[PDB]
């Protein structure tokens, strides 16, 4: 009960920053989830025993893919931390209680491919979800992992916030699907701009909370330029992957996923700033002041793939 979770004195300090690495030390990210818990949510949120067994059954349920493993799933989280505590007054009891664990959970048992590598496999979750077919996989392994004996850590909320958190994580890692995010920054944009926004009309928070979860998805590219260069090598690792199974299957896989186009990775990287990242942290930005710091991380790593393209580096 009287027990706070602490940092050594950098990684205190740091860990309020957008731009924070949790650093290589793996047995450190639960105690490094479960201080951000405690310090956006209170230490009475959740049963401590309960979480503990919660996300060691989360991070079990990751796999040791280049990319989309537990490290990405507490990145992804750190950052909805940072956007949760520099917008205290914004956010609901149940938003701040719901968004880190959405965060935490929000790639779930992937296996390295995307939507479309499944649909043309004809693995069985394409049968199963038509769309959105990892992210439908996702949540439903949360739910999985929610019902296993003492992992409800929501089990002292009323039925009814019962109901509401598990539709507000439903909607967040649904929302992780970039195939969605096009639309959903392209309404926000209109909406923020004729000044219709509107923070009270539930579907407008839905929207709102759906960039948040596009922007904390993508934070690798936020990051000081070394951990986003290298990131980068684990995302084409799992990308050239997925394009040799393509070529297995028979199919010629898009650019993004041909490792024979190695030598274009830095102007795929400027496709990407500018069609993705920097509309979505842009947009977050006129919405969320207080998130411009990703915004300006971001355009200063567009820069730095400029230069890689300019052979000064
Ligand atoms: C940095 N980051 N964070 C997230 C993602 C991303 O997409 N998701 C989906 C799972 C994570 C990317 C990312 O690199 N995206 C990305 C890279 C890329 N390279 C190319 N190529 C290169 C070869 O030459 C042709 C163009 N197209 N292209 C398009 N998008
Ligand atoms: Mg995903
Ligand atoms: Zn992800």
Redesign the pocket.
């Known amino acids: 009960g009287l027990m706070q979770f602490t940092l050594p004195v950098r990684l205190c300090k740091e860990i309020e920053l957008f731009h924070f690495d949790i650093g290589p030390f793996e047995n450190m990210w639960p105690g490094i989830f479960v201080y951000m818990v405690h310090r956006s949510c209170g230490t009475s949120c959740f049963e401590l025993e309960k979480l503990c067994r919660f996300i060691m059954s989360v991070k079990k349920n990751y796999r040791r893919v280049p990319?989309?493993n537990w490290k990405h799933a507490v990145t992804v989280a750190h950052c909805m931390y940072a956007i949760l505590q520099n917008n205290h007054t914004l956010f609901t009891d149940l938003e701040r209680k719901g968004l880190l664990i959405a965060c935490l959970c929000h790639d779930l048992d992937h296996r390295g491919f995307?939507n479309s590598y499944l649909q043309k496999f004809d693995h069985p979750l394409a049968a199963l979800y038509s769309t959105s077919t990892m992210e439908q996989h996702h949540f439903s392994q949360t739910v999985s992992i929610l019902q296993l004996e003492g992992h409800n850590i929501f089990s002292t909320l009323s039925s009814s916030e019962y109901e509401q958190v598990l539709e507000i994580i439903r909607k967040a890692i649904i929302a992780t699907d970039?195939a969605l995010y096009f639309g959903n920054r392209k309404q926000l944009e209109e909406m923020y701009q004729t000044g219709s926004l509107n923070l009270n009309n539930q579907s407008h928070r839905d929207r709102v909370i759906g960039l948040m979860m596009t922007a904390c998805?993508?934070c690798?590219?936020t990051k000081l330029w070394p951990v986003?260069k290298l990131?980068?090598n684990d995302?084409?690792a799992?990308?050239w992957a997925e394009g040799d199974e393509m070529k297995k299957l028979g199919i010629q896989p898009?650019?993004?996923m041909?490792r024979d186009?190695?030598?274009?990775?830095p102007?795929?990287?400027l496709?990407?700033?500018n069609?993705?990242?920097i509309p979505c942290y842009t947009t977050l930005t006129q919405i969320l002041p207080p998130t411009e710091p990703l915004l300006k991380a971001c355009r200063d790593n567009l820069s730095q793939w400029e230069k890689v393209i300019r052979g000064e580096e």
């Open positions: 990319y989309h995307s970039l998805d993508l690798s590219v986003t990131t980068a995302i084409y799992e990308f898009i650019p993004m041909d186009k190695k030598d274009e990775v102007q795929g990287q496709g990407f700033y069609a993705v990242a």
